[PDB]
Amino acid sequence: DNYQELRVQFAAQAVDRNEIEQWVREFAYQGFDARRVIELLKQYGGADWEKDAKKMIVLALTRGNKPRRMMMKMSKEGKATVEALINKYKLKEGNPSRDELTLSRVAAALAGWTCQALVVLSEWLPVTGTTMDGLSPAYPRHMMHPSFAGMVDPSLPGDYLRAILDAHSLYLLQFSRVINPNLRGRTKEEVAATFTQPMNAAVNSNFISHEKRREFLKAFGLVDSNGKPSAAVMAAAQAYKTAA
Amino acid sequence: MDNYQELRVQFAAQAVDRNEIEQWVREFAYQGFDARRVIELLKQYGGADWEKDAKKMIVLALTRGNKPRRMMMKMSKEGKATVEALINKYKLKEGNPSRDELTLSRVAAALAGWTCQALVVLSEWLPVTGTTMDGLSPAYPRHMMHPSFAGMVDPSLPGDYLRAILDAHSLYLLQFSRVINPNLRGRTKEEVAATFTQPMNAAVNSNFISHEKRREFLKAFGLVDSNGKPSAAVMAAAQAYKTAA
Amino acid sequence: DNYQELRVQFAAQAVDRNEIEQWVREFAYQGFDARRVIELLKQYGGADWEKDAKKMIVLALTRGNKPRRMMMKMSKEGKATVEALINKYKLKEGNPSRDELTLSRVAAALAGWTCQALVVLSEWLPVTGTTMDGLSPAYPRHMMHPSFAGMVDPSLPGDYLRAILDAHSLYLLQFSRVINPNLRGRTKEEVAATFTQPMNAAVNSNFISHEKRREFLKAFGLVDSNGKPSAAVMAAAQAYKTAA
Amino acid sequence: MDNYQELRVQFAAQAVDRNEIEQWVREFAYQGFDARRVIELLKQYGGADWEKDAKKMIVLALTRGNKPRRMMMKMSKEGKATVEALINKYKLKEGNPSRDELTLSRVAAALAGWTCQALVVLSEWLPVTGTTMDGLSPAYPRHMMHPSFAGMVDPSLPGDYLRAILDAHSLYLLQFSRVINPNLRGRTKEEVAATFTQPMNAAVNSNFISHEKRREFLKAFGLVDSNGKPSAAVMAAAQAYKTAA
Amino acid sequence: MDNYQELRVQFAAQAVDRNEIEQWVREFAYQGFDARRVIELLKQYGGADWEKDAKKMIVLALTRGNKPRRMMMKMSKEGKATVEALINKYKLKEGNPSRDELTLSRVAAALAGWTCQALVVLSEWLPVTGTTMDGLSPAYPRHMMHPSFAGMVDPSLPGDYLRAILDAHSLYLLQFSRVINPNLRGRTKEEVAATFTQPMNAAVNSNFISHEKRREFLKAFGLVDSNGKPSAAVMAAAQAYKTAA
Amino acid sequence: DNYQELRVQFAAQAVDRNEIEQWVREFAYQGFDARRVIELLKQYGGADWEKDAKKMIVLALTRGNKPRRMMMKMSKEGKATVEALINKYKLKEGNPSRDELTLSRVAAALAGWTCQALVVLSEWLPVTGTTMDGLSPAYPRHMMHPSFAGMVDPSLPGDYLRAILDAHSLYLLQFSRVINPNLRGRTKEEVAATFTQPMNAAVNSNFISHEKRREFLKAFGLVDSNGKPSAAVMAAAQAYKTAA
Ligand SMILES: O=N[O-]
Ligand SMILES: O=N[O-]
Ligand SMILES: O=N[O-]
Ligand SMILES: O=N[O-]
Ligand SMILES: O=N[O-]
Ligand SMILES: O=N[O-]
Ligand code: NA
Ligand code: NA
Ligand code: NA
Ligand code: NA
Ligand code: NA
Ligand code: NA
């Protein structure tokens, strides 16, 4: 048994690009499992799942991702509603197994609705639309949640895709610093290192086709019928370039 | 079949109803305290004695704070006995307990109409005195000198008038928050504001005391005129908050 | 049961200034209970209480307020005397109940004698008279303990009262910083925030009448027969104004 | 008698044999991992499946890191199942365990000849990308972009050529060590170098893969010519490391 | 009746007797050690061997310190055995125990008349050497180079002469306190002085060894003349302490 | 029993310089017991002790003084050798009793060989000869371990002795800072305060006579036949003078 010979023979094995890249995708970072999230919503929720999901998205966007914590500072009626949601959907916090629901996961799996809701919810978010407008004129409300990444069509022409992601990153920079106060004294590049992984995971996920995602981007007014980013997106992308 | 992509796209096609969503926002919003429950508990525990006891507890809250066991350690024998009896009768707690528990601060907040009037008498015995406030803004409104005041604000006031009322009140909240907490020593105005704006806005926007009755109190307190326009003293304090550090 | 109506009716209740101010006084900060202190001294001490109290005042002023701690660095004779005092008077430390004695409480309750003793004890105090003299010429020794606050007549004309308290505060500023080393890097205003509460409590307490307190101030040479502060008091008040 | 001074002086008179002492130095030198044991364990646990599984584990090491339980917490259901099976079959551990335990990093290191080739494909999915490296030194050699590369270095190369190869590799190691560890934020080049030079030199000088076969890999990778002279890209990267901060 | 105000005012009318109060001050003053008890314990434990053992313990205190168990860990077999026997015989402890316990430092302090003389021989083996002291003040008095020296000071010396003696001694205490404690690194002269002045003054003012016998030692040590006037070397060291940092 | 009289009579006792200085030496700091180290080596090692000691010195100089720690990062063969050494010689770490061996103690007790080995081992030491050469030209390799102190003849003329010790201290300054990283931000004088005690202990120990130590210094080329330090020693001494 010549271990040195086994080693050199191993090195002589093909470097199969197709095979290796498939493994990369198989082992890639995944933030959440959209198909499982919806399956669980339908399972626990039955006939009530759609309305309950909408409530859970409003909760995620205006109060956060800790159901037991938010209950401590809430009206009697609101607390009762959340209590019932926890018991019905077995809601957890943070990053449990894929067989468990969280408020943030509901928002992410149903991003088409979430992003639209941001238009309505703007002034009740941790970073408001008004604040974003100070950084870039008419900042797109549809981009104002990490859930937006799942609406991005990665097959857009490179320059258009980059503009969409840079624009969205301007929000992510502000949002990350509000949610995690310890990121306030860190550079843009350092903060980006913390939000790019989940962003790219959703951009490149197998959930919602390229064509359907671009349809959402067009419906949201983020790109025109030719896929070119809106003036507001271009402004925000430029603002990200010079952001600190 | 179980087409989750299809279910997701049809979910996205459903109405994003502004009126419906805004109702949910209100249902799920931050609540600092439950005024109706506070008064219910006062009446329950206090019976015929609740009104007088509530006034005592407000004076206690405004001059000694929100820690009944702590304040008893530095008090006259007679005062200590009064507070001891109040704790046992009303089951008083410290800080922020459940909705089913009373605290001194919650009594003051639930009964803000009286609390804000009492501030006129109590000015020189508050943690931040009226005299101190006067150095920051001339003739500072005494009615604004407790977090309880937020529950007297009418959120339907014209944007500029509402902003002035809140900015003026925030001048006090800035000083008060720094005095009661030596821990919040070297932080900026905005960092201190982050500690008081959430409970402030919750009381401003709560369903307790109608918009009209709130404005009536503001008028009675001399903080706004018949049209809701803030007084000279309020405007002065709002400007002082803008330039405050 | 209309809770909103109950609330507005409550607001319509009179704001009785006399009633409210009486409550303020009833609930006011009290540092110690002078009447109880003397009662306990007489009870535990019997025929020996007066002499023992004098010893306890010397202990409080030259060693501090921790009887068990000071015993660890004391002559055999001194240790035995303190041991006996602890056992006889059940002496405690810090802020126990009003039914318990401490060395500092004895000094405070019997401030008339304590303040006179300071003349003799000056160079053995944590802040010496010599040190005080560097800050203000001929600093009044009678003011050199927190116990002095109980000798202040709050009915003195405002300017005279202010001068007395400012003069006393010059000492309190130095003393607080010696006893609590963490106050050394804090501003005068910040240090004042820590000594003004117990000071004012004693100034405004119901123990020893206005007339009798002013008699002490006159006997100590701190005010003249017309209540006007001495030159030394005025000097110290001015020194406090410009102190850091 | 028991003359310890005499025994000590006669000990000092004994040979200080350079060849003997240098052999002891080698015997007792730092070892980061045991390549022969790694391959033995792979063959033992894997059987007919070991080669394909090893390739998977190398891709896993290079794109997700050295913590199999941690990476599983953010992975597809299918990916998680593959990794779970790999852990159970090969008894995978994290960090630096005993010689009798496999880790993902050890698989990559023991099979560096293949690992370094895979880096050409994997460039844009590594913690520090090839594109990032190109900004620091133009056309940075992809084959050098893993600590595994140290095991491909022939220590018998002429002094200047060896130094260039190692300096060029160290440019990557500087960036890589800072990226994977936010803990090593505000430290200098030399302080970061202190964390990677020991395992680097151990692999460079190890008895695994002959000097001649190592140089053959370097030649095949286009890093040196037929005489062992480093490529233009290697020289550029060596210079970049000199002036790096 | 129980008129506590009356009792308090009549208490204030009682004599504030300077002589009586000053006696109490002395009774209750800080005591660092009890010299009479130290010598009693030495005689008790040591019997016929106490004098020689005391000298050994003083040499031990001055050259190794006040931790007998610690010093044994870095000592010859013979030295260790001597110290071990001394610990068992005299029940030696570290730091500051009760009056009924001996320490090495207490032996040196209780027998300061001999300790200060031994410093002349021991100069170059102390934590701060005489040579080091000479760089700060020329011909620094060796007799002053231990805290034990404080017990040789006559507090009845004229104010200026006493101050000079203590200032000169304090120059050593400043250096000594900083050397034996790496913990007291970045503190000022006054902050270091706060750590040594209390035990210094206690020994200066203690009832052990008469004022006259203390001055006799000072004269014998060449530190003062027949009139109590400090030597040139003492004056030089006093001036050095004034300008020291 | 007059304790004051006993005290003054004690002071009247002779200050015997011979007696006192003998006690100083008896109680002096000792880093290790060379005679005991060799006795233990011979006892545990029997016929193998000399070869094993050489291995242990190479271990001490190239890996350090923690046998169980170094084993964790070592070849299978090397680990087995060290394991056997630990079991045979009952090797410990740090500062155990004199009846226990450590790797550093073997190197120190057999310094004559250790110092020669440094010539061979230079580039594998924590501070290399190459590094030392940057500070002082042709730095003497024989000085590059704390073990060297036991080769120093304290009877050398003062200037020659000082030059030897200053030269050796240049290495000790660099070495101490590498082994103890917390000494990096400390002054030369502060670092010296940590290495001078063990240095002087070995310089002045009763192990290996003055004549034999000087013979080693001459054989190592550190002094000439007249005891005068080499040019390299003088260079290093000067480098220590101006070192930070
Ligand atoms: O991790 N986003 O599918
Ligand atoms: O928390 N104010 O309703
Ligand atoms: O608290 N002084 O009565
Ligand atoms: O640790 N590389 O053999
Ligand atoms: O503490 N000296 O008596
Ligand atoms: O401590 N050296 O013998
Ligand atoms: Na998404
Ligand atoms: Na309302
Ligand atoms: Na008093
Ligand atoms: Na090899
Ligand atoms: Na005396
Ligand atoms: Na040695």
Residue numbers in the entry:
A (entry chain B), C (entry chain B), F (entry chain B): 2 to 245
B (entry chain A), D (entry chain A), E (entry chain A): 1 to 245
From the paper:
The N protein is the most abundant viral protein in the Phlebovirus virion and plays a key role in encasing vRNA in a protective coat. In addition to its critical role in protecting the vRNA and the antigenome (cRNA), the N protein also plays an active role in RNA transcription and replication, as well as in virion assembly. Here, we present the crystal structure of RVFV N forming a hexameric ring. In conclusion, the structure of the hexamer formed by the RVFV N protein presented here shows that oligomerization is mediated by a flexible N-terminal arm, which binds a hydrophobic pocket in the adjacent subunit.
Using the N2 fraction, crystals were obtained in the P6 space group with unit cell parameters of a = b = 180.9 Å and c = 47.4 Å. *Values in parentheses give the values in the highest resolution shell (1.69–1.6 Å ). The six copies of subunit α that surround the crystallographic 6-fold symmetry axis (black dot) form one hexamer (labeled I), and the three βγ dimers that surround the crystallographic 3-fold symmetry axis (grey dot) form a second hexamer (labeled II). Hexamers I and II face in opposite directions and are offset by approximately 10 Å in the direction of the c axis. Hexamers I and II in the crystals of the native protein superimpose very well, but the two rings in the crystals of the selenomethionyl protein are slightly different. We have determined the crystal structure of RVFV N in a hexameric form, which shows largely the same fold that was previously seen in a crystal structure of monomeric N. The two structures differ, however, in the position of the N-terminal arm. In the previous structure, the N-terminal arm packs closely against the core domain, while it extends away from it in our structure. Extension of the N-terminal arm is crucial for the oligomerization of N, as it mediates the interaction with the adjacent subunit in the crystallographic hexamer. (D) Docking of the crystal structure of hexamer I formed by native N into the EM density map of the hexameric N-RNA complex.
